[PDB]
Amino acid sequence: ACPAPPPGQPDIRAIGYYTDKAGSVIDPALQQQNKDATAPLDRYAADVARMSDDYLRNGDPAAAQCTLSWLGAWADDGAMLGQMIRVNNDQSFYMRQWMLDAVAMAYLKVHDQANPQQRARIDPWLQKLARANLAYWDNPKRRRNNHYYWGGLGVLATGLATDDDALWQAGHAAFQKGIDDIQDDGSLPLEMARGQRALHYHDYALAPLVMMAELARLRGQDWYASRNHAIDRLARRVIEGSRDPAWFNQHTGAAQLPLQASGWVEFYRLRSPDGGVFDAAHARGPFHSPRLGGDLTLMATHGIVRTP
């Protein structure tokens, strides 16, 4: 049957772990403190991705029903709509954005099996989560780096799964901020500030944008073109940096930590002129990222959704 959903807590208390302004040197103790305070959150994101994956893999509505049941349970519970407790930075907000990405993607993947009683309980929950996140970004004091783009993913997914065109435009807007931040050398001036993790965060900035561009395709919309294919520039710099960190290691004062490019390559393999460049990355194996929707290999090959 459907296993019992964990109780949904209406509060996030996450902890920051970078020590320096570059957001590069992890404090392993504060990182293990966050891993323990966000393990219930991650376990649910993994569980709703896993079951949404299972429905895609074999069509079985039971996995889609158990996914919808868990989401509606956490919607009833008002999960994550509480106080985002500030320990040493905005990690609790970040965590809500990433959890929104996971649950909104997982809803999406199983949305063609939802009763009208499921949508009515799930849709206002995701729309509250999304508008709560957008409100953080209404403040011009908040620098719109990769966090803005990751927030865009879940906002956009909610707008698409709830048929909310103001949330769709909001997502599209963050995507456009991404593509417009991409310089002619393929870099991103704010992620170039991450020192050791400049490459890492370039990759981190790409995955949501690519993923946003795929949700666009679900409405029959090609956003990969924008700004003289600026996403091709950013993708180029990431994949040619996962093998050759020399450019980042030079352009940043710091030496890079090796990168295995994220599962966005699963999708961009099918969209670039020479998808062959992504053969090594592809071979590193089936990519799973709940925050990015789950089984990216599955969704790249057979589609984020079974039916439109």
Residue numbers in the entry: 22 to 329
Article excerpt on this structure:
Unlike other PLs, Smlt1473 present in the clinically relevant Stenotrophomonas maltophilia strain K279a demonstrates a wide range of pH-dependent substrate specificities toward multiple, diverse polysaccharides: hyaluronic acid (pH 5.0), poly-β-D-glucuronic (celluronic) acid (pH 7.0), poly-β-D-mannuronic acid, and poly-α-L-guluronate (pH 9.0). To decode the pH-driven multiple substrate specificities and selectivity in this single enzyme, we present the X-ray structures of Smlt1473 determined at multiple pH values in apo and mannuronate-bound states as well as the tetra-hyaluronate-docked structure. We have built and refined the structures from residues A22-L330; electron density for other residues outside this range was either weak or absent. The structure is composed of 13 α-helical segments (α-1 to α-13) connected by 14 loops (L-1 to L-14) and two β-strands (β-1 and β-2) (Fig. 2, B and C (i and ii)).
To gain insight into this possibility, we analyzed the statistical distribution of B-factors in different apo structures at pH 5.0, 7.0, and 9.0, which were solved at comparable resolutions of 2.63, 2.20, and 2.45 Å, respectively. The protein is least flexible at acidic pH, most flexible at neutral pH, and has intermediate flexibility at basic pH. The pH 5.0 and 9.0 apo structures possess higher flexibility at the entry site than at pH 7.0. However, significant rotameric transitions of important substrate-binding residues such as K42, K162, R163, H221, and R312L have been observed at different pH values.
